[PDB]
Structures are given as C-alpha cells and as structure tokens.
Design a protein around this motif. Structure first.
Motif, PDB file in Angstrom:
ATOM      1  N   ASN A 203       3.757  -2.257   4.631  1.00  0.00           N
ATOM      2  CA  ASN A 203       3.195  -0.946   4.301  1.00  0.00           C
ATOM      3  C   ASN A 203       2.498  -0.877   2.940  1.00  0.00           C
ATOM      4  OD1 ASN A 203       3.834   0.469   6.680  1.00  0.00           O
ATOM      5  ND2 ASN A 203       5.902   0.958   5.945  1.00  0.00           N
ATOM      6  N   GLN A 205      -0.347  -1.355   0.754  1.00  0.00           N
ATOM      7  CA  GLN A 205      -1.774  -1.626   0.901  1.00  0.00           C
ATOM      8  C   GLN A 205      -2.349  -2.541  -0.168  1.00  0.00           C
ATOM      9  OE1 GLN A 205      -1.306   2.354   1.094  1.00  0.00           O
ATOM     10  NE2 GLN A 205      -3.052   2.963  -0.170  1.00  0.00           N
ATOM     11  N   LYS A 248      -2.119  -0.406  10.707  1.00  0.00           N
ATOM     12  CA  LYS A 248      -3.554  -0.616  10.812  1.00  0.00           C
ATOM     13  C   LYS A 248      -4.022  -1.788   9.938  1.00  0.00           C
ATOM     14  CE  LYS A 248      -5.842   1.204   7.026  1.00  0.00           C
ATOM     15  NZ  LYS A 248      -5.870   2.681   7.027  1.00  0.00           N
ATOM     16  N   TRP A 249      -3.311  -2.057   8.841  1.00  0.00           N
ATOM     17  CA  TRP A 249      -3.728  -3.097   7.893  1.00  0.00           C
ATOM     18  C   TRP A 249      -3.692  -4.482   8.530  1.00  0.00           C
ATOM     19  CZ3 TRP A 249      -5.777  -0.737   3.834  1.00  0.00           C
ATOM     20  CH2 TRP A 249      -5.272   0.512   3.447  1.00  0.00           C
ATOM     21  N   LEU A 252      -6.757  -4.811  11.064  1.00  0.00           N
ATOM     22  CA  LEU A 252      -8.022  -5.053  10.367  1.00  0.00           C
ATOM     23  C   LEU A 252      -8.065  -6.478   9.830  1.00  0.00           C
ATOM     24  CD1 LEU A 252     -10.752  -4.184   9.183  1.00  0.00           C
ATOM     25  CD2 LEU A 252      -9.518  -3.036   7.299  1.00  0.00           C
TER      26      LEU A 252
ATOM     27  N   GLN B   1       1.766   6.312   2.067  1.00  0.00           N
ATOM     28  CA  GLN B   1       2.795   7.194   2.688  1.00  0.00           C
ATOM     29  C   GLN B   1       3.004   8.482   1.882  1.00  0.00           C
ATOM     30  OE1 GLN B   1       7.157   6.336   4.094  1.00  0.00           O
ATOM     31  NE2 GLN B   1       5.905   4.634   4.869  1.00  0.00           N
ATOM     32  N   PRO B 226      -4.968   4.083  -4.756  1.00  0.00           N
ATOM     33  CA  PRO B 226      -3.922   3.783  -3.783  1.00  0.00           C
ATOM     34  C   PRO B 226      -2.543   4.260  -4.202  1.00  0.00           C
ATOM     35  CG  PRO B 226      -5.369   1.916  -4.005  1.00  0.00           C
ATOM     36  CD  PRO B 226      -5.733   2.864  -5.094  1.00  0.00           C
ATOM     37  N   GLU B 227      -1.800   4.781  -3.227  1.00  0.00           N
ATOM     38  CA  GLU B 227      -0.393   5.140  -3.347  1.00  0.00           C
ATOM     39  C   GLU B 227      -0.116   6.365  -4.216  1.00  0.00           C
ATOM     40  OE1 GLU B 227       1.077   1.275  -1.389  1.00  0.00           O
ATOM     41  OE2 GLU B 227       0.929   3.441  -1.038  1.00  0.00           O
TER      42      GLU B 227
END
Ligand SMILES: CCN(CC)C(=O)Oc1ccc(C[C@@H]2CN(Cc3cncn3C)c3ccc(C#N)cc3CN2S(=O)(=O)c2ccc(OC)cc2)cc1
Ligand SMILES: [Ca+2]
Ligand SMILES: [Zn+2]
Lengths: 307, 324
Positions: A203, A205, A248-249, A252, B1, B226-227
């Motif tokens: 999770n 990214q 999804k990561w 891709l 998230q 991000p995040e």
C-alpha cells in the motif's frame, strides 16, 4: 473566559507590535525589541517583518558588543528558534531565520544542527522544511553523498512515511555516480531494495513511484541478469495481484514491466491488464486510456520497423 | 489511504450569493488583526474571487488603490501592509490587483521592475526579499509580475529557466530549491513559470501529469503530495498545473467538483480547507477558481497561470500558450 482571553491576547500582541514599530522608526535597535518580538513570534511565526526586526537588532548589537556578548546573544537566539520550531515546525520564516543565523556564525556547530534535523525527522519524517534544512547543513559542512545515503536507508526500513526518504535517495544516488541512467550494478541493487519495500507494504505508493523511475533509469539491450530480474519481478507482482486484487499499483507495474521486457510480445497481456486496471482505479481511467494509446502507437512503429 | 469522508448532508450546490456576502463583509476580529502581515495578498484573494463571481464593484476600489500606493517602498518593492517590509509575494499581489483595476500606473512601475531585477541571483534564482530566502515560488512571483508589466526582458531569462529546471525531480515534479521534494504548490509555480517563459516543451508532461492525477483521493479531493490529507488549495494548484500541461482530463472532474462543494460553509459562506472546517478568503478563492477550471457556468473563466479572470489577461494581451 476562552473567547474573552483571546481579546486579552489580541491587545497584548497589538500593543507589543505597536511598541516594536515605534522603536524601529525611532532607531532603537536594542534588546527590548528582542523581548517584544519573542512574545509575538512564538504564536505568530509567519509575521515576516518581525523576523526582519530581530536580524536588524542582532546585526546592530554585533557592532556595539563584545565578542563574548555577541556569542551569548547567538546562543540565546538558537534556543529561542528551537522553542519556536517545537510549537510550529512548518513555518517558512522560522527555518529561514535559522539558516540566516547559522550562515553568519564564525564557528558553527554543524554536527549539532544535523542532530537537530534527525530529531525533528523522528517526529515528522515528511517535514520538507526540515529535509531542506538538512540539505543546507549537509552542503555547508561538506557531508559526502554516501553518508547521507546511509541516513536514508535507516529511515526507510525502521517505519513507513517514506516518500521524502526515497526522494532524497533519488538525488543522492546520481551524485555517487556523476555522469555528465544509473550504472547497472547500482540499479540492480536499488531494484532489490525497493522490491522489498513494496512487498513488505504493498500500500505504500512511495516505493512504486521510485520503482517506476528505476524502470526508466534498453529492451533489446537487456543483459541476461537484468532480463532475469525483471521477469522475476513480473511473476512476483502477479503473485501480489492474487493476494490484493484491488491493488492498482501492482497492476500498473505489471504493465510497465512488460513494456520494459518486450512491447510486441506482451501486447495481448498488456491490453488485458489495462482493462482490469481501469476497473480497479476508475478515477484514473482517462490517464490509463492515454497511456494505452501511447503504447499502441509505439507498437505500430515497432511493427513497421520489420524488414 | 489518509482521506476525508464526505457526510451525506454536505453542501452539493454552489452558494454564490453567500460567498459574495462573506467576502464583501470580511474584515468589518481576531484573525483579521492577526493576519495583517499578509493583508495585500488577502486583498488580492478577495478581489479576484469577487471578480470571478461578477461582484467586484461591491469592493472599495479607491480605498484599495490608496492602500497599494502607501505600501510601495523607496526600493520599489511592495509590503503586505503599511509599515511592514517589502517582499516579492506582496509585490506580485499588488500588481495583480492593479491589473484587475487597470490602474498599474498608481505605483512606480520602473521601480517595481528595478526591485524584481535586484533579487535575481548568479544561479538565476530569486530571493523573496533582501534577507535571501530562495524558493521557486519567488521565480514565479518575479516572472508573473514582470509579464503583467510587459517587462519580462528585464531579468536574465535563460539563467532563470536553468535554475527552475535544476529543481525538476525523479517523479517529474518540482520543489522549493534543487534537491527539494516535489510539492503541488511548487509545481504550480514552476509550470506557471515555464508557461510564461515559453519552455513547456521541457516538462515531462506524461510523467508529471501522472504524479498530479495520483493526488486525487477516493473522497474526490486532491492532496499536495503523497500520503497527505486533501485540501481545497492544493486541489487548485494541482488542477491549474494539469491544465497548463494539457492533462486536466486525467482527474475525475465530477468527484472533485463534489469535494469542493462540500467545503462550503452554508451558514457563513466561504470555503474551508476541508469539509466542516472554518472558512477563510484564501480557500474561498481557490474553491471558486477550481470550479471555474472544471467549467462551472456561473463563474468567469480563470487563467491557470495567473489565477485571475481570463478576460483581464486578454485585455492586457498576456496569455501564455499552454500544452492546452
Ligand atoms: C503557490 C502560490 N504562491 C506563490 C505565488 C504562494 O505564495 O502561495 C502560498 C502558499 C503557502 C503559503 C503559506 C500559508 C498557507 N496557509 C496555511 C494553509 C493553507 N492550507 C492549509 N494550511 C494550513 C494559509 C491559510 C489561510 C490563509 C488565509 N486567509 C492564508 C494562508 C497563507 N500562508 S500563511 O503563512 O500566511 C498562513 C496564514 C494563516 C495561517 O493560519 C490560518 C497559517 C499560515 C502562503 C502562500
Ligand atoms: Ca465599489
Ligand atoms: Zn489549504
């Protein structure tokens, strides 16, 4: 009481501010101004003109004070700044004043400043002001890239919130191999490290973003070791796809790996993965259609290269 | 998230009359007196959002012009308020306001240009003021100010470009200074800079565009990196950047529209950073400007480069080509 006290605050700040400006116009560059501004800047660190006032006072006092008295004033300023940063670690003005202060010191203690950075990054590993300050300190003290690279590695493995750390790595790695694309042995080690990261936490990214960069850092130039490493990553992502069918990561990244391996051979599979990914990540459907169109056009050109 | 959840009774329609009343009455007070250090920019945010809504006339033009004149210092720079110190941020804000009012000659334009020119460094970067803070935000302030005055030729443009491009990162974005992490705010400043200087062909639009569209969270709101949590302001910075590089369609426009509407305060008017929070003029401009970019009929078209009504920029013939 609560709403009443915020009128009491208002008037003290108001009167203090009034006082600073009167003194400033009067040319009273003295320690009373430091006193008045300390009472305001703690709660209101974005009041830039008051930081300017402190610098003007410190500059003036440096002229009419003994080296020992100037040294005491600097130490007081460092402590005031640290206290301000504890209250609001995200103010541009506070971090800039510290940079201004450290840049003009005769004997700056840079090791102490790097430790302060480590401390603040323990509290918020994403604080960009602090990362920026650390880069400033690193340059000033001629700290070498390999040393900073060691720092990033400990931060990446001990917990998450890694985008800032991975970003720092992307800037440091090219400095250890300064070319007027990373060398393959370096790249292979990086692929291993990032692959651990996203298989540990699929999770996060940051690892996936960094991995995409490494995939761009030739296909018909693939060594057997790199070819084999990429094929292994492909199968490992397919395994993850089973464990996390809404991730999804990984989907891709499967597409990007097939592109890195052999666009035409994996055409069918690539188009299948685009359909699944769009279903899993619908907000990005337009991006994914444009990426696929780009890839289909690339494939047309590759097919036309045929002798 | 990390995200917000929009409650089912959040506002879902545009409350234009309420926002105009909120801004028209603003500063009639704790936060007002406490934000005097940003007053000039506060004025810019208020006037621009009123003009986008067709309500600029309800503000006090003559009062604001006198205030602006009183904020220009002998060096040519403009301060946030009377007796505060000059800075590129408030110099841009002032020039934006005067452009809205077709009143640029209320200040000494030659001295503004001189001030901007003086703040460029050997590496092409710009300091915000005499105290030397370097930020790509200030490269944008410099060229946007000069573009509006017709005086972009006053600075060293190729060096300014070299500095900005030296701030481009692995992910296609840009930060404050070389080596700084990508951030939506700085991406807006750098893409706006490259639009003004005719250098958008140097952006990796597919890569940066991907990083930008990944800012959209399931709530429909956009974060600034991000995040992090979504925010109306970062959301505008992301949308404008996407528009500059011709990839505004890479986000879900209806979902973002619903997030922005949910940030309105239906009692007081204004927009907050996120639903349920207290509103301010800064987030009010960016909420309205975002909706305009998304094609809201009741709001005037907004320039993604200058964050001013397009009709104003058309008037002065300053409309940088985009990658659409
Ligand atoms: C990218 C556009 N540019 C360059 C042309 C630019 O300078 O924009 C800015 C970006 C950030 C700032 C710093 C803050 C931003 N904030 C705080 C904020 C915004 N979103 C979430 N947060 C926590 C705010 C918030 C509200 C208002 C108003 N009204 C103004 C700002 C502008 N500044 S600030 O340092 O002056 C500030 C103001 C109030 C505040 O407490 C409410 C905290 C900081 C200032 C200007
Ligand atoms: Ca009026
Ligand atoms: Zn915000």
């Amino acid at each position: 009481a609560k709403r009443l006290e915020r009128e009491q605050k208002l008037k003290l700040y108001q009167s203090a501010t009034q006082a600073v400006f009167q003194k400033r116009q009067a040319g009273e560059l003295d320690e009373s101004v430091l006193e008045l501004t300390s009472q305001i800047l703690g709660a209101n660190p974005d009041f830039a003109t008051l930081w300017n006032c402190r610098r003007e006072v410190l500059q003036h006092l440096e002229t009419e004070k003994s080296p020992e008295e100037s040294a005491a004033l600097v130490k007081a300023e460092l402590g005031f700044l640290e206290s301000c940063l504890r209250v609001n670690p995200k103010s541009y003005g506070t971090w800039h004043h510290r940079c201004w202060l450290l840049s003009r010191l005769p004997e700056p203690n840079w090791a102490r400043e790097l430790e302060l950075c480590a401390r603040f990054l323990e509290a918020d590993e994403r604080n960009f002001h602090c990362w920026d300050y650390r880069r400033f300190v690193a340059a000033q003290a001629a700290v070498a890239p390999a040393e900073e690279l060691a720092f990033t590695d400990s931060l990446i493995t001990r917990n998450f919130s890694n985008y800032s750390s991975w970003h720092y790595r992307s800037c440091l790695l090219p400095q250890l191999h300064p070319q007027p694309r990373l060398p393959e042995n370096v790249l292979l080690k990086e692929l291993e490290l990032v692959q651990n990261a996203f298989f540990t936490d699929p999770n996060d990214q940051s690892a996936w973003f960094y991995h995409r960069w490494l995939l761009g850092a030739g296909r018909c130039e693939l060594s057997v070791e790199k070819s084999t490493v990429l094929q292994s990553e492909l199968e490992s992502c397919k395994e993850l796809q089973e464990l996390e069918p809404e991730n999804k990561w990984c989907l891709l990244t499967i597409i990007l790996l097939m592109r890195a391996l052999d666009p035409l051979l994996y055409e069918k599979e690539t188009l299948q993965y685009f359909s699944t990914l769009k279903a899993v990540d619908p907000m990005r459907a337009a991006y994914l259609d444009d990426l696929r169109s780009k890839f289909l056009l690339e494939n047309s050109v590759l097919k036309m290269e045929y002798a | 998230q990390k995200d917000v959840t929009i409650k089912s009774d959040a506002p879902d329609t545009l409350l234009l009359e309420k926002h105009a009343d909120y801004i028209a009455s603003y500063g009639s007070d704790y936060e007002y007196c406490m934000s005097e250090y940003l007053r000039m920019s506060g004025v810019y945010w208020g006037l621009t959002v009123m003009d986008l809504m067709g309500q600029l006339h309800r503000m006090n033009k003559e009062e604001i012009l006198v205030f602006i004149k009183s904020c220009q210092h002998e060096c040519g720079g403009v301060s946030a308020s009377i007796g505060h110190d000059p800075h590129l941020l408030y110099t841009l804000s002032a020039v934006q306001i005067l452009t809205l009012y077709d009143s640029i000659h209320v200040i000494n334009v030659d001295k503004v240009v001189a001030y901007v020119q003086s703040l460029q460094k050997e590496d092409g970067s710009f300091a915000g003021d005499i105290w030397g803070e370097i930020d790509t935000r200030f490269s944008f302030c410099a060229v946007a100010t000069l573009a509006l005055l017709g005086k972009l030729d006053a600075i060293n443009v190729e060096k300014a470009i070299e500095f900005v491009l030296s701030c481009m990162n692995f992910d296609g974005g840009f930060g404050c200074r070389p080596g700084s992490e990508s951030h939506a705010g700085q991406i807006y400043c750098c893409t706006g800079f490259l639009a003004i200087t005719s250098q958008l062909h140097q952006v990796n639009s597919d890569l940066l565009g991907w990083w930008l569209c990944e800012r959209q969270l399931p709530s429909g709101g956009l974060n600034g990196r991000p995040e992090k949590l979504p925010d109306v302001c970062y959301s505008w910075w992301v949308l404008a950047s996407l528009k500059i590089i011709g990839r505004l369609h890479w986000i879900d426009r209806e979902k973002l529209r619903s997030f922005i509407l949910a940030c309105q305060d239906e009692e007081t008017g204004g927009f907050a950073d996120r639903p349920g929070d207290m509103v301010d003029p800064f987030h009010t401009l960016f909420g309205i400007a975002g909706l305009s970019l998304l094609g809201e009929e009741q709001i005037k078209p907004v320039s993604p480069v200058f964050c001013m009504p397009e009709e104003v920029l058309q008037r002065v013939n300053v409309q940088p080509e985009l990658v659409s």
